[PDB]
Amino acid sequence: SSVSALKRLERSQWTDKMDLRFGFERLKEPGEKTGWLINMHPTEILDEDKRLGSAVDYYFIQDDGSRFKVALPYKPYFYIATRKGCEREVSSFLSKKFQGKIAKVETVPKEDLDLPNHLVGLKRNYIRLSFHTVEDLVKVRKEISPAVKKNREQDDQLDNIVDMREYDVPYHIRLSIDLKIHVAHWYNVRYRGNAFPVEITRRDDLVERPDPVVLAFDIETTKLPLKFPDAETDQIMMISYMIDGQGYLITNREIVSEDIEDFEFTPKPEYEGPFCVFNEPDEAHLIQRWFEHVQETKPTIMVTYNGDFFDWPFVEARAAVHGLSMQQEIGFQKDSQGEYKAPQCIHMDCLRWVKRDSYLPVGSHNLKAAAKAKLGYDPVELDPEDMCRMATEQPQTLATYSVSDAVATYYLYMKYVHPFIFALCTIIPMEPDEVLRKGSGTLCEALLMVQAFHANIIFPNKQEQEFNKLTDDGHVLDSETYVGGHVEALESGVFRSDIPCRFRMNPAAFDFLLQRVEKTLRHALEEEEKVPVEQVTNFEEVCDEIKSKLASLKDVPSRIECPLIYHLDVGAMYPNIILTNRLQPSAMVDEATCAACDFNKPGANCQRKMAWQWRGEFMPASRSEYHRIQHQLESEKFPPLFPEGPARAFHELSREEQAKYEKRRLADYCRKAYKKIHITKVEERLTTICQRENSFYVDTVRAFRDRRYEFKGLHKVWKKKLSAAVEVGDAAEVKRCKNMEVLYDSLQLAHKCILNSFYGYVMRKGARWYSMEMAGIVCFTGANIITQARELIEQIGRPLELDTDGIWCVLPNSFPENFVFKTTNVKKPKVTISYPGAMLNIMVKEGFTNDQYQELAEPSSLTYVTRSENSIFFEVDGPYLAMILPASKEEGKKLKKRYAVFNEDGSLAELKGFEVKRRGELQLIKIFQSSVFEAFLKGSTLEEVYGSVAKVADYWLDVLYSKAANMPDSELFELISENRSMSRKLEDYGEQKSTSISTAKRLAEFLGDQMVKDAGLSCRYIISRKPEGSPVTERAIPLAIFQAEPTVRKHFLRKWLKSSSLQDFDIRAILDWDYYIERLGSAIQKIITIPAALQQVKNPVPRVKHPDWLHKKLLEKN
DNA sequence: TCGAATCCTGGATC
DNA sequence: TCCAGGATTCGA
Ligand code: SF4
Ligand SMILES: [Ca+2]
Ligand SMILES: [Ca+2]
Structure with a gap:
């Protein structure tokens, strides 16, 4: 042990040597200094007792460029729960058994949400252990753990222990949780003297950050x-x-x-x-x-x-x-x-x-x-x-x-990254590099730890996984999940404001809408604006305008008119649903717990019931066969897991690996007794969400939303002030304002990130708070709102795309778009209301919103106040100039998330399901796709639009048909050469064949086995025609030959082509032109020619065919 | 005997 | 983590 002690002392002095070399002096004598905290790390340090104790270093910087370290000792601790009343006796055993390692043992009560009746106000005691150094935490944990498991499975001094918590939070995170220290705050620190601990105080007085020196290379x-x-x-x-x-x-x-x-x-x-x-x-x-x-x-x-x-x-x-x-x-x-x-x-x-x-x-x-x-x-x-x-x-x-x-x-790092990382880091305990490298789900948990500490709530364990769990009828499950929502492109084609279209719409829907028009705007005024109608003079005038417009629509339901392209979406829908429904990771209970809760009495209103859909995939075998396989594995001993030891009984091997042995043996059995590979089943369930469980999680989400909007407001103010400062041109004020603008914008982006992360945590495997129910109930509800939205719009008009967070929509030009109201309140002289949004908002307000929220009035009486709330709220967008969707080659299949959109300016607003660069795609498609979309804006009626955009394909097709006769061959190579590179050794495949492989064998043949030796061969190939009929994995020719000496080319080409009688070798002779002309066909057919036949226009490009299903559907429809 | 399903490989530094 | 492209495997 002493050798490890001196080794860690050696590394400690080595670090201090580096720090002195980099000018990070220590504090050494009593005094006070103010500094900005940039970084921290754990370290073991001595004290007056010459014992070795665990500590943490903090690194501070100053405006003058000075730098200093400080170090603070702190003692790890963890909790254990005895069987009832055993605290003194077991503590006496622990103190006897680990004297000289246990630093202290102590009794404390805690809040514990799983305790029966705990909302009445019961509590439980936990013992707290603590140790002088993190190694003894390990040593004691390893000895206690197996007695914990034994006592769990069975249900003397160790036999008395029942549960153990909080033994795996990182020590330096523990310290920031306990002592409220976060980096990129300003601090003042007092060193009282070597006899004494340092003390640290926050200085939120100072907002402006220092500038670290940054190096990039x-x-x-x-x-x-x-x-x-x-x-x-x-x-x-x-x-x-x-x-x-x-x-x-x-x-x-x-x-x-x-x-x-x-x-x-x-x-x-x-x-x-x-x-x-x-x-x-x-x-x-x-x-x-x-x-x-x-x-x-x-x-x-x-x-x-x-x-x-x-x-x-x-x-x-x-x-x-x-x-x-x-x-x-x-x-x-x-x-x-x-x-x-x-x-x-x-x-x-x-x-x-x-x-x-x-x-x-x-x-x-x-x-x-x-x-x-x-x-x-x-x-x-x-x-x-x-x-x-x-x-x-x-x-x-x-x-x-x-x-x-x-x-x-x-410049990328300074401008985009630096203020984001040092903004986000202000709200999380972890180190900067952890916060950058760690997965975003863990940040949500670390943030929740702070609240759980302040709420005095003891953590749960990490979620234990079960092995080969069974249904009640004994199907061994293989997969289990919530029924996810769906994405679907409803229609394909080209839509633009300039091109009239035909609409059919049910007149009775208008005779419903026109009943509610005042109510609708009243809601938009009363709830959304919070400006009562009594503050407006002309409210009647626009209402009668609306009623006239609705009547004029009702008079002629079937029509042709120009389109209005609108996008409807909900910002942060999932957080809003959480806030509205009071979902929390511990609000669920079985009805077996409400049997205990004293608040269960007639006419109580704490039970809210909501429903979700579940899906499973499982094997057909039932309880007998699985138990017989288990007894088979028990009756016959296993070999050693690898041949470096004796044979093993079932109790002598890794249980998790035995789960894989069982799975494999079931998969091998099943085809004898049963005749299906998978059974996939869907089911629907409902769960009681306890509406007055402790609330800290929702309170956190609400606090983050409100702070987000505060910082957006301040950012807008400071942006205006920045425009004023830059107009004035006063470099110090310009600096001050720009600094504030960046700080606020980074803070609002950081809170946006956390808010979006708050959903994604709850589904994570192993995480401390976890329940797929809450993941399901949100997601299923997230479909109803969208489906009922289309259940309206499909009567008024036509939806084009349905997506997880919104829809894309088209409405007749005659529809009421927006209005302004003449306020009396000069506080806000004019307000604009977009009618298509307000008409939707009241629907979701009426149907969805919770009317049984509850909140605590008085901790000593537990009097509760009932309430209602909603925050689900649609937003409108655009309207946009044009939108385009592709179509699939195969019948009966639906695209996803693939389209283009253009703004009223005519510049691209969106382009999605495509990308303008890829490393795995040939140049011709990349150019073609770019040029077609930019051409689609041209022309003025549908026959002109297709007649114009056909002109790009009818260019490229004649480029290929003319063998690119006039094109330079260096361009030809760049136009048709694929690219690939290999991330593996050729030996590691053994045998298999693909075009990516064969070229490497051929390059070896050309250059010798030097190419084989290792990963990272880069290769370029073209596909030859001459060896007729063989699969395309054969005909690939590596480009490098065509640079080589003529006779060498002839020698290898006659070989690889299997033609002892070819008498020309200029590339034009060799290339399989038909392959490329076909594969370009397989792009044009997805954009130009299928949609036109799907939109009542004859094929604009006769030199390429339709598939037969469309040809027959065209003939039979004609 | 042909069509549908399954699995494989890469992207991100040069 | 997600999709295109190709070949093999599986079923009528
Ligand atoms: S819903 Fe009401 S009765 Fe049920 S556990 Fe919660 S407080 Fe008790
Ligand atoms: Ca580099
Ligand atoms: Ca580089």
């Missing part, structure tokens, strides 16, 4: 063609980085042919990017220079793109090959999980954010796309085959490109 390398770079053979060729708006470029002068000299590269006036240049004799000097410059400038935040996965290891290895050990110089080291970390400097990252939080569509996560979308400029791109060629022949081009990764990533 990237490296570029040699590598062999068609391969990933090799840490053992390749050499770093240059490294480039930004510090706080300044750029430096270090060149490995051995390779780069010329002495680079300084230059400037600005993407835009907002991005200056001046750059300074250094030349170093060789890679060892470049790495020395960089390790010197970092240790000089002492950066505090490092930032990099994907840097954990590629960029760090390549530096670490080459430094080690020169003996310049990374970890001693900078400090960065690989953690247990595989992330590079350091004690004094935080490794921020982008791609974790681009994934988790940035709302960007899949496959557009490439840096260059993110630069286009959020930064809005054209980065430069160059084919990684050429790197060495430029280095030999044209260095300035390689510099010019290679700086443009740094100048992009630094």
Whole structure:
């Protein structure tokens, strides 16, 4: 043990050595200082007793650039529950058995929601243990746990213990829960003296943040063609980085042919990017220079793109090959999980954010796309085959490109990432890098821990999984879930305001609507505006206008008119449903508990009942067969799980793995006795939601909603003030206002993120508070509101798309759109009401809203007040200029989430179910799809619209038919060459065949087995015609031949084509033109020609066929 | 004997 | 985590 003690002392002094090297002095004598808290880590530290105790370090910074550490001791503790009344005796045993390890043992009561009648006000006692250091927590936990399990299964001193809680919350999270310390607050701290603990006080007085120094860097390398770079053979060729708006470029002068000299590269006036240049004799000097410059400038935040996965290891290895050990110089080291970390400097990252939080569509996560979308400029791109060629022949081009990764990533990080992470971190205890790396579901739980602590409620355990659970009829389940909602495109076609369409609508629906018109607007005034009608003079005039319009619609229900395109959606519908229904993760009970609760008496109104749908997939075998298989596995002993030990009885093996053995043996049996692979069943259930259970969760959600709207209000105010400051042009005031604007906007984005996270936690596996019921009841209710909405609209008009959060709709031009009301209250001189929204809002107010909410009046009397509430509230959008949907090639199948939309300006408002870039798709489709949508806006009637957009396809088709005769072949290659790359060794497949594989075998044949050796072969192929009839996995030809010497080409082509008599080899002879013309067909048929036949227009492109089902349906309908 | 279903592989650094 | 594309497997 002493060897571990001295090892952890060694690492402690090593960290303090680094901190002194990076200027983080300690506090050493009594005094007070004010500082901003940037980071914290746990550490073991000595005290006056020379014992070793667990502690936490806090790192503070000051406006003057000074920095300091402080450290605080704190003792872990965890709770245990004895059998009734045994507390003293068991505590006497614990104190006897673990004297010298237990720091203290104590009795305390707690609130515990599962306790019978607990709402009457009962409580239970728990013992609290505590220890001098986190190791003894482990040692005691490991010894107590099995007695806990034994006593659980069976139901002496350990036999008395019954339950145990709260033994796995991280120690440094524990400390921030208990002592209310969060980072990016300002603090004042008093060191009273080494005899005494420090004391820390919040200073919310100070709002303005300091500026940390930030460093961003990237490296570029040699590598062999068609391969990933090799840490053992390749050499770093240059490294480039930004510090706080300044750029430096270090060149490995051995390779780069010329002495680079300084230059400037600005993407835009907002991005200056001046750059300074250094030349170093060789890679060892470049790495020395960089390790010197970092240790000089002492950066505090490092930032990099994907840097954990590629960029760090390549530096670490080459430094080690020169003996310049990374970890001693900078400090960065690989953690247990595989992330590079350091004690004094935080490794921020982008791609974790681009994934988790940035709302960007899949496959557009490439840096260059993110630069286009959020930064809005054209980065430069160059084919990684050429790197060495430029280095030999044209260095300035390689510099010019290679700086443009740094100048992009630094500004992206500063502008978008930095105020988001340091906003979100203000409300969570975890460290910044945990908050970035950790999955968002865990943040919701950590946040809920704070409230559960302040409410004095003891945590539940993590949810235990069951093995091979059974239905009552003994079907072993394989899957179980709530019935999810659905997405469906109802119709396909092209819709635009300019193009009249035919409508049919039921007149009786209008004779219902016109009865309620005043009531409708009254509601919009009374509930939504909170401006009583008595504050308006002309309320009657617009009501009679509306009634005249409704009458004019009623007179002629079937008509042709221009369309109005509206989008209807509900903001944050699921939180609103939670707030409305008082759903909580512990509100459910079985009726067996209301049998106990004294509040169960005649005419009580605490029971709310609601319904949800459940789905299961399970095997047909029943209780006998499963129990017989279990007895089979008991009667015959297993082999050892692997042949490194003796045979095992069933009690001597991993139970969870035995669950897989049982599953496999059932799957092997079933086909003898039964004749179905899966049975899938759906069912509907209802559950009593206790309406006056403790409320802290809903109170949290409501608080977050209200704070969200507060910060939106302040952001609007500060944006106006910023416009005023920028008009004035006073640089200090401009700075102050812009700082406030960023701080408020980041805070509102952070709360938006948390709010959206509050739903996604409840379904998570293993999480502390969990119930699929609450996940189901919300989701099923989220369908009724949408279905009843269409149950209205489909009588008025036509819905085009139905989606999880809203619908897309089209209404006759004659419909009442919006109005303004002449207020008397000059506080708000005019109000505008959108009638199509207000007409919907009252429906959901009437049907859905809760009228049996309850709230506590008095803790000593438990008098309760009944109430009603609602917050479900539709929002309207647009109206939009145009919308387009595709159609499926196959009959009888429905698209999802795939369409385009255009705003009244004519610019794209949306384009979804597609993307403008992919690494796995050939160029021709990408160009074609882009050009067709931009053409669809042209023309003025449907026959003109299709007559115009046909002109792109009838271009490309003749490009192919004319063999691209006039096109340069370099363009031809770029137009038709696929792309792929292999992430595995060829040995790891054994045998299988696909086009992605065959090219690698052929490249090996061409270059030798050098290509085989490892993962990361990059390959480019085209599909040949000549070997007729074989599957397409055969005919793939790698491009690299066509660069090679003629006779070598002839020799290998005659082989792979199986033609000893071909006498031409120019690519035009070889290409299987028919394949490409077909696959372009398989795109055009999904956009232009099927929809037109589905929208009463004759085929606009005769050179491509319809499928036979449509051809017959056309003939039979004609 | 043909059609429907199943499973496989990649994207994200260079 | 999600979809396209291709081939094999399974059923009438
Ligand atoms: S709903 Fe009423 S009777 Fe049922 S457990 Fe809750 S408080 Fe008791
Ligand atoms: Ca790069
Ligand atoms: Ca990189």
